[PDB]
Design a protein around this ligand. Sequence first.
Ligand SMILES: *C/C=C(C)/C=C/C=C(C)/C=C/C1=C(C)CCCC1(C)C
Length: 226
Amino acid sequence: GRPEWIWLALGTALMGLGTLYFLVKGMGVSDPDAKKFYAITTLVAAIAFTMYLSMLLGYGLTMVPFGGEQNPIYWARYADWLFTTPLLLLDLALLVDADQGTILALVGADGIMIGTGLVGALTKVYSYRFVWWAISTAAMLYILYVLFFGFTSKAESMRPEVASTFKVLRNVTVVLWSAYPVVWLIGSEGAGIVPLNIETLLFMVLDVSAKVGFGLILLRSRAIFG
Ligand SMILES: *C/C=C(C)/C=C/C=C(C)/C=C/C1=C(C)CCCC1(C)C
């Protein structure tokens, strides 16, 4: 019964409830466009629910040696984010009608971000763990640059309702995503300053906010209608 399980149980519950609500509401809408957003967003919550559940049950956890200790690394997180982060970017891209090349470059950068992030979380040479972390953060900053400079401009061709909805989602995304590299840096994966139970609480608040929070804002808006 690890100290962080209570936060994993609360995360499972919140992701589960969000998944159900998104599923029920999406199943009733007939609009084709509205449906796309509902399917993507419900999938994002569903994947998070399953991974929180797996971790709650003892999976996705491995001891990596470094800094003279056996460090508890929850790798199930990257299995979640590998698929949920680019899906969230997809929601945003579809909202502003971004083009093919942009989406591909964004998803590719997102793949690098999660990939190098996991390599770093598994690296046994302490200093190198931060080399990988640095590359992952640079990848994330590219994504945030594109969402802020590129997309916002693209939402210029949209109607107030949609441009308005994108800004809120963009703002929530930029604030939440920018927090992840800091939590990693000071937590179990990096400096080991913040204990795993508190770190798990921090990631749970961020995850739930970035998926269920983002989802509620997105799905209740009129901008999802084609
Ligand atoms: C539902 C999950 C979301 C929206 C997750 C977002 C996760 C990030 C923006 C993660 C970023 C990371 C870095 C910038 C570097 C270190 C490792 C990561 C993967 C924690």
